[PDB]
Design a protein around this ligand. Structure first.
Ligand SMILES: CC(=O)N[C@@H]1[C@@H](O)[C@@H](O)[C@@H](CO)O[C@H]1O
Ligand SMILES: CC(=O)N[C@@H]1[C@@H](O)[C@@H](O)[C@@H](CO)O[C@H]1O
Lengths: 142, 142
């Protein structure tokens, strides 16, 4: 179906049971090392703090972090690479009480314990070297 | 004026006196560390060898390299950062007899000695976190 603009910005709220679903594909082969970045921002401004930073170097590594009062905190680096060269991915990020859980094509792939309350999130940005066909934030829970 | 598609691909030939001129701007503030990549490819295929790889992490560093028979060679890393936060840039890459010379907004900023004859180049790709308004390869010289 249709392409969303990239970089993609949507105003968002998150609490426990919220799911962010992202369908997309890398713009180029893994040999050229395309990136994907998903940032959960505390304001609509791109300079705002990031509760959850998720950055894929396709075929190589994933880094997760937070930016709190303008400053990057403890990097978590993963060599877990469920993303397939040249394929569409479906990414689903669940807000559990203790952490974010990242599902890649239906497989649990990364978790990241909450450093800031998910209620602090006001915006989600999806950007770098991807096309996007689907973006959804679920709003079913009290 | 109008935006070119990014990633941007143009079939190209280079020899001594050839200039590649690129006008663009980063998609986001330097705090979010947008990238720019310019690759001079030996074929139209994106998997093809790269005679000259130029990768800016805006506000941080520049790496230059070649990919020869699929393999990255000796990285050159520069902390020279003439790019201004939130500004349009003009990038001009000249083919001199011994090297590429990179001008940023009219200032000599990087050089890269030839590892492969520039005549090997068949394609130029400009990609990552930029908008593009201008791309030109000059063809004035014998
Ligand atoms: C909560 C808060 O003010 N966060 C700010 C953020 O908005 C931005 O201005 C950043 C720039 O470095 O600095 C942070 O300290
Ligand atoms: C000259 C040549 O064949 N270069 C190839 C390149 O086209 C690509 O296939 C790459 C994939 O790793 O391998 C290189 O050795």
């Amino acid at each position: 179906m249709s392409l969303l603009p990239v970089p993609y910005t949507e105003a968002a709220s998150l609490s426990t049971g919220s799911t962010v679903t992202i369908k997309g594909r890398p713009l180029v082969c893994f040999l050229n090392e395309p990136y994907l970045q998903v940032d959960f921002h505390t304001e609509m401004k791109e300079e705002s703090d990031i509760v959850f930073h998720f950055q894929v170097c396709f075929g190589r590594r994933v880094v997760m972090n937070s930016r709190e009062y303008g400053a990057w905190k403890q990097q978590v680096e993963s060599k877990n690479m469920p993303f397939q060269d040249g394929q569409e991915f479906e990414l689903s990020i669940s807000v559990l009480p203790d952490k974010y859980q990242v599902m890649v094509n239906g497989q649990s792939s990364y978790t990241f314990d909450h450093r800031i309350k998910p209620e602090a999130v006001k915006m989600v940005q999806v950007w770098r070297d991807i096309s996007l066909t689907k973006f959804n934030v679920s709003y079913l829970k009290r």
